[PDB]
Design a protein around this ligand. Structure first.
Ligand SMILES: CN1CCN(C(=O)[C@H]2CCCO2)CC1
Length: 182
């Protein structure tokens, strides 16, 4: 509808796949080469389905901060025959607050879904499903089941992936450039 939705669509159309684990279907953001991200509660194993194709997992790492606190981001390297467009230059370098974000989801239940969530707060600490979690972004939208893994963007930036909600607010795990250096 406007330039926020334009940037979101450009990310969705080239840098997402549908990931299926034994815990459900998730929006999955591809970042570069065969490297993608998914919420850690997806419980990635040795095999995952990517757009309904059986795919070997070459590596999976559940990220934690240097205090050994959950970040709710798992970085997955896929045994896929195709690379993702490299979008690492759209990742923020530091923790920040944002204006005017979009949450974008693509699954069997919610294809081509875009939500203007408005202002994004650097919330920090969240007890997420009973797990102490750091680097949480918060937005005042009543997000629902089916949205985990959804991509949070501003114009110019890919800032997080949706990991939860409390019925009135939604919560995303930050993406930082430093997670994807090699
Ligand atoms: C023609 N304009 C310049 C190229 N753009 C991009 O690279 C998109 C894709 C990912 C997010 O931004 C924007 C459109």
């Amino acid at each position: 509808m406007g330039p926020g939705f334009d940037f979101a669509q450009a990310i969705m159309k080239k840098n997402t796949v549908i990931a299926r684990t034994e815990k459900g279907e998730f929006t999955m953001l591809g970042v570069y080469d065969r490297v993608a991200v998914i919420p850690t509660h997806a419980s990635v194993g040795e095999i995952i389905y990517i757009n309904d194709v059986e795919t070997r997992v070459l590596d999976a790492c559940a990220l934690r901060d240097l205090t050994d606190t959950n970040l709710e981001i798992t970085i997955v390297k896929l045994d896929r025959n195709q690379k993702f467009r490299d979008i690492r230059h759209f990742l923020p370098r530091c923790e920040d607050d944002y204006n005017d974000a979009v949450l974008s989801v693509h699954t069997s239940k919610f294809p081509n879904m875009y939500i203007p969530v408005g202002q994004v707060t650097n919330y920090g600490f969240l007890n997420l499903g009973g797990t102490p979690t750091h680097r949480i972004l918060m937005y005042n939208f009543p997000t629902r089941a089916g949205q985990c893994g959804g991509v949070v963007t501003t114009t110019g930036k890919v800032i997080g992936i949706h990991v939860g909600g409390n019925g009135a607010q939604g919560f995303a795990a930050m993406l930082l450039h430093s997670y994807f250096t090699d």
